[PDB]
Amino acid sequence: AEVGRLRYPPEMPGAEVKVYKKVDNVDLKLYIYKPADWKPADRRSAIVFFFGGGWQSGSPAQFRPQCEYFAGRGMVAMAADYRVGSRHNVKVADCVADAKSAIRWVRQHAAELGVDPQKIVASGGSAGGHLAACTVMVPDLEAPEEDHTISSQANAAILFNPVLILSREGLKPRQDWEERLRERLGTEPKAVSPYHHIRAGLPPMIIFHGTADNTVPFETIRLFAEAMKKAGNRCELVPFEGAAHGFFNFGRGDNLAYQKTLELADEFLVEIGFLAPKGE
Ligand SMILES: [Cl-]
Ligand SMILES: [Cl-]
């Protein structure tokens, strides 16, 4: 509900604004937070957050607090806008293209951003967590007007109650439901279903999910994580006992889950060599 009251477009005080994509006569922006000691020539890790809201609504403001945290730790942290149903009459596949365009843009512009182009983390909540996962493991579905010699693939992901299974193929593949998914998603459902793209050799990830989630059942995420681990990938699943969809957000449950998810995300980033340990 609180997340639902966020402003669009957001103020994002202290952020630098860059347009990463011009599409359908809208300028899609990144809201960029740099560390206090940032200099051109830096080669910092970066994180790009994609807001939640069912691919229908939401605001980059959702992840402003996390951006401020990670910029405090020395990352170039940013929150991306992307097209949504209520504002732009797009479908899920369009959202995925925008998320991929954002990672591509950060990589293309890594030098001027003071960023290491092989340390770009994709992150998000719910629908935005789906997008982040798509940037790590789903093939590009379109080639927009952008540098396709530059990869859209993120180097790691941090997912907050993501949607990871968008097709029922290979679960316990009924036709009419997959056809309804096709019309909603703008493509074959498997083409935007991270679970259907599990293979060896993928970037590392951490996932935070409530065990009492009625929106995205925890069991879908357990299945995902088990299969990823079977494929040899680093896929850390942190259950939040009794928590529901949206539990991790700044401003709810006394900020306890907010703080805990940041702590664990920080250690994950140290583990994979994207952040220096807090001990310096
Ligand atoms: Cl790895
Ligand atoms: Cl829920």
Residue numbers in the entry: 1 to 172, 176 to 283
Paper's wording?
The purified TtEst2 enzyme has been crystallized and the structures have been determined of both the native enzyme and its complexes with three different reaction products. This information has provided an insight into the substrate specificity of this novel thermophilic carboxyl esterase with respect to its exposed active site and minimal ‘cap’ domain when compared to other members of the α/β hydrolase 3 family.
Carboxyl esterases (EC 3.1.1.1) and lipases (EC 3.1.1.3) are enzymes that catalyze the cleavage of an ester bond between a carboxylic acid and an alcohol group. The TtEst2 enzyme reveals an open substrate binding site, which is solvent accessible due to the absence of the usual ‘cap’ domain which is present in TtEst.
